[PDB]
A paper describes a structure:
The structure of MsBP displayed two chains in the a.s.u. No electron density attributable to a ligand was distinguished in either structure, indicating both proteins were crystallised in ligand-free forms. Overall, the structures of MsBP and Zn-MsBP overlay with r.m.s.d.
The presence of the additional C-terminal subdomain places it unambiguously within sub-cluster D-I, associated with a narrow substrate preference for carbohydrates.
Author numbering: 10 to 18, 20 to 48, 51 to 108, 112 to 410
């Protein structure tokens, strides 16, 4: 039997129950036992210590790089059928220094869910689309409505949107040698950007202590004018808070002057300890073929990495006839995500130790937002702490 490990998937039990069921009908010799987890490295280490490593593991570019730098992922090129990469988007297939360590699965382009009713209360007609327009926008929301314009968490190991904003703001995080590269005019400007927003009462005070689940809660309460989220969460807004969804419009995500948006890549990898690597590759290919990826794109309102499924999903969206405004809203969001994908890139560099770097930056930025140190003081402390870590790991 094979053990499949997926990341943060309750709402998608029926999808998994059918596709894995189909797999079990096709491959009775390698039945799948599925476990979904949130905190992934601790559980992989325990299974590998017991010499019971899973066969297919769901990863993202940052975590996949930490594992592959240590020789833990199978080079799939040896086992992949010839012309298997032809079935995937080339930009996302090549998004995996240790060879081909992962097969692309699905991906998400997050949009700006804008509360249009809060905008009219603030005397605004639309939400900003670039970060240098965020302060003026946030002030108008804060003073005329009392609500908050946006919510970006600085809890060290929560969402990476803050670190992604650094990249969108032109900040260079690491050089070749893995040394700190953000003590630059861009990095100091980015640190001051977030410090000044918090100190001026423009951000919710709990951004230093709560993650995107609080942002979700604030938007559904009508207390957040812009929520960085995808199409799938829009349907739960429709059910949980119809008053807010009725005045919600999907909008392009916030970017920097370069325009690039972020895309969250989900992949499937085969640990080197796996004793059924060939069957594991077959399972990863089955989960990511045209039919299964298209079906998951519909049920999850997500974008696939399969060319066949991506074109099929784009085609269904262009000719979909929604029966009510709710379905039309969901169609508008999914279509905007599919259109944004042509300009979106992966922004957190798929390098080892990026979560250590995120934690150091978020911690120092947090000290500056609370007024315990200056912004430049946070930059220096972050730079020196990262170089402490980087000299020990990569001398």
């Amino acid at each position: 039997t094979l053990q499949l490990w997926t990341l943060q998937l309750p709402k998608f039990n029926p999808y998994m129950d059918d596709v894995l069921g189909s797999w079990d009908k096709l491959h009775p010799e390698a039945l799948v036992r599925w476990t979904d987890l949130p905190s992934v490295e601790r559980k992989l280490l325990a299974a590998v210590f017991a010499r019971t490593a899973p066969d297919v593991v769901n990863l993202n570019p940052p975590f996949a790089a930490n594992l592959a730098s240590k020789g833990g992922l199978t080079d799939l090129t040896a086992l992949l059928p010839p012309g298997a990469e032809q079935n995937y988007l080339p930009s996302v297939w090549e998004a995996a220094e240790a060879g081909q360590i992962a097969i692309p699965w699905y991906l998400t382009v997050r949009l700006s869910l804008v509360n249009g009713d809060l905008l009219r209360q603030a005397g605004l007609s639309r939400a900003p689309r670039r970060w240098d327009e965020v302060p003026a926008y946030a002030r108008s929301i804060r003073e005329r409505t009392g609500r908050y314009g946006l919510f970006v968490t600085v809890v060290p190991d929560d969402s990476a949107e803050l670190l992604e904003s650094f990249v969108q703001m032109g900040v260079s995080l690491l050089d070749a040698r893995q040394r700190a590269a953000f003590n630059t005019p861009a990095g100091r400007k980015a640190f001051a950007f977030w410090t000044d927003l918090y100190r001026e009462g423009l951000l919710p005070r709990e951004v230093v202590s709560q993650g995107q689940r609080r942002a979700i809660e604030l938007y559904q309460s009508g207390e957040l004018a812009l929520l960085a989220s995808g199409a799938e969460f829009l349907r739960s807004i429709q059910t949980n808070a119809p008053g807010v969804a009725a005045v919600t419009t999907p909008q392009p995500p916030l970017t920097g002057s370069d325009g690039t948006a972020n895309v969250a890549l989900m992949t499937l990898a085969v640990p080197r300890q796996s004793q059924q690597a060939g069957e594991a590759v077959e399972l990863a290919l089955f989960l990511t073929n045209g039919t299964n990826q298209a079906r998951f794109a519909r049920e999850a309102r997500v974008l696939p990495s399969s060319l066949e499924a991506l074109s099929a999903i784009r085609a269904e969206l262009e000719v979909e006839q929604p029966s009510n405004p709710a379905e039309a809203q969901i169609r508008d969001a999914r279509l905007l995500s599919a259109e944004t994908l042509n300009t979106a890139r992966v922004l957190v560099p798929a390098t080892p130790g990026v979560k250590r770097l995120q934690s150091i930056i978020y911690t120092q930025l947090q000290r500056a937002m609370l007024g315990q140190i200056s912004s430049d003081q946070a930059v220096l402390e972050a730079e020196q702490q990262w170089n402490r870590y980087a000299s020990a790991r990569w001398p």
